Swiss-Prot record, chain B:
It comes from the Eukaryota. The chain holds residues 2 to 81 of 713 of the full protein. Disulfide bonds: none annotated. Belongs to the WD repeat TUP1 family. Acts as a component of the CYC8-TUP1 corepressor complex which is involved in the repression of many genes in a wide variety of physiological processes including heme-regulated and catabolite repressed genes. May also be involved in the derepression of at least some target genes. The complex is recruited to target genes by interaction with DNA-bound transcriptional repressors, like MATALPHA2, MIG1, RFX1 and SKO1. This is General transcriptional corepressor TUP1. Associates with CYC8/SSN6 to form the CYC8-TUP1 (or TUP1-SSN6) corepressor complex that is composed of 4 copies of TUP1 and one copy of CYC8. Interacts with histone H3, histone H4, MATALPHA2, RFX1, SKO1, PGD1, HDA1, HDA2, HOS1, HOS2 and RPD3. Present with 5840 molecules/cell in log phase SD medium. It is found in: Nucleus.
């Protein structure tokens, strides 16, 4: 009965050890997940801004070709 | 005049392209917002569930220790 | 003994301490959920205003090019 | 008035380059800020959990001190 009680205590103190080990492991895992997901969205948006900037310059180059073209319809 | 026609058609293609690029960015705002909170909540809830589990085990440890104490107090009481 | 009184003391105090510690973890988690939303929204809204400003300047730039072309169509109208 | 139109084009293209640059520099700033915020809250919770764990450790110690004492009486008697 007392030794049963001691058994209960020994089980519980192992449960506790396991529970705090799991908490520390999961913090690392979550941190890596969060970093990945944040970086994904940020790199995605950075890529999207790059594509927009490229398109703006493409528009500007194209206006220059058209202006050249009118500078030849004129000639 | 082929050059005028070509550049105009090119311009129209790029104007359409740039409109969709902007919309893809703005469209994604509520979806990224929803996902951010869903991910935050998944972690928060798991972490609270774990803390509560530790809390219960500590409580069980404490009741158990006190049961053992209720065995020594009664043997000391027999003893006397 | 006087000592058993004092270990029962530490016990009651350790138990009170652990209770406060758990409560503090739970209160912080709920406060931090709000900080997440508030912080996210501030940045989100800033990025929305900036993209819109870029979209508006690009529109002005395109409209301006239309203006120049207009000038050339009329000189050619000749 | 085309020359001025050209001035206007140049001014607006400059504004757009400056705006794109600002979006990029702000995203970089935000990324580090976000991580520092995340890391502070992660480390704070880990520290709180460490403190709880040590409080448990101590509970166990003084319980053993209580037991040990009851064991001296059971002996005495």
């Amino acid at each position: 009965s007392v030794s049963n009680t001691q058994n209960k205590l020994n089980e519980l103190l192992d449960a506790i050890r396991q529970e705090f080990l799991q908490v520390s492991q999961e913090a690392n895992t979550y941190r890596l997940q969060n970093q990945k997901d944040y970086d994904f969205k940020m790199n995605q948006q950075l890529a999207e801004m790059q594509q927009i900037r490229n398109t703006v310059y493409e528009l500007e180059l194209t206006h220059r070709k058209m202006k050249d073209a009118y500078e030849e319809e004129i000639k």
